[PDB]
Amino acid sequence: GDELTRSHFNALYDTLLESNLCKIIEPFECVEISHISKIIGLDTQQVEGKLSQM
């Protein structure tokens, strides 16, 4: 309901995501995208969309 709280919601969304992606990117890459979505727990299109933007 609050506009300021919603503005910081996307900031916390990318904050916890960057910490989770850093755990995936730190080891060697070339892992299945479906396995990445199972760790994050979101839609495949949402994981590919937020990661490619970063």
């Binding site: 755990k23 730190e26 080891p27 060697f28 070339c30 892992v31 299945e32 396995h35």
Partner: protein, 293 residues
């Protein structure tokens, strides 16, 4: 009578405001009993606070027998909640020289097997290489030869003989009732397996440059899901690095190319012919001596 927390809370609200650090003879002895009350109660926070008083002051005080022996036991009893084999191993560095000087080999043999068990299960460190040789090594002891081969085992460990060695000789390994709390031996099986897997992947990077993931799972005594669990902690903590290909099932060393090849690595080829003209020039005169004489 069976009351613990009642006697601990009363003594904690008294002895703290009691002694003004005047006489240290009765003060050090009574705190040893106050720290034990927090151990039986299961409070790790209070036991750590009480261990910061007389432990450092005893080092300046003259060495006494029972006082130093109580510190060795209390630091192990507080490890029940912590369960850190690296920190306890540093506390046992004093007793290693205590039983080898003050005491005899009677109590020095069981302490020798204990201190190594904390070093074998230690995650890592810069002093682990210097703790291999130690001082009293090669004492011709049955328990020493078992632990000495275990330290060098991690380099060649294939985890093929791992279940065999633990069954025949298990002094500190599988079943340990001394200085370890627990409801079963399952903690010895899980904690020891975590260290042998990390050291297994560490030596593969120095030996196998490229290895199939299907063969790697059999060497680590793990599965497809269990293999990615241990390797993820090694890379995230900045220990080692490796290559993991899920669809290709390929595990490589991932040799860094950041050295700019010829701009740096060429330093290995300058020593090849550095001894060329030097060795030949010395042998020209040397061969003519044996030919002329």
């Amino acid at each position: 009578e069976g009351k613990i927390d009642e006697a601990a809370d009363i003594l904690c609200e008294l002895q703290v405001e009691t002694y003004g650090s005047m006489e240290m003879s009765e003060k050090i002895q009574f705190i040893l009993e106050q720290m034990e009350l927090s151990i039986l109660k299961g409070d790790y926070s209070q036991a750590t606070v009480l261990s910061r008083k007389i432990l450092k002051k005893t080092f300046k005080n003259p060495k006494y027998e029972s006082l130093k022996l109580e510190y060795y036991n209390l630091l192990v009893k507080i490890s029940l909640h912590k369960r850190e084999y690296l920190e306890v191993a540093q506390y046992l560095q004093e007793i290693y020289q205590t039983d080898a000087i003050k005491s005899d080999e009677a109590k020095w043999k069981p302490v020798l097997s204990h201190i190594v068990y904390f070093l074998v299960l230690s995650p890592y460190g810069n002093l682990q290489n210097d703790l291999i040789h130690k001082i009293q090594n090669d004492n011709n002891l049955k328990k020493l030869e078992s632990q000495e081969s275990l330290v060098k085992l991690f380099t060649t460990n294939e985890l093929m003989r791992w279940p065999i060695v633990q069954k025949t000789y298990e002094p500190v390994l599988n079943e340990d009732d001394l200085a370890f709390g627990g409801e079963a031996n399952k903690h010895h099986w899980e904690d020891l397996q975590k260290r042998v897997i990390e050291h297994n992947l560490r030596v593969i990077s120095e030996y196998y440059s490229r290895i199939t993931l299907l063969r790697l799972n059999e060497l680590l005594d793990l599965t497809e899901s269990q293999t990615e669990t241990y390797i993820s902690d090694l890379v995230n903590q900045g220990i080692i690095y490796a290559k993991v290909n899920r669809p290709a099932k390929i595990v490589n060393f991932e040799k860094p190319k950041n050295s700019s090849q010829l701009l740096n690595e060429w330093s290995h080829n300058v020593d090849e012919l550095l001894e060329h003209i030097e060795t030949i020039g010395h042998l020209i005169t040397k061969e003519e001596i044996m030919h002329g004489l």
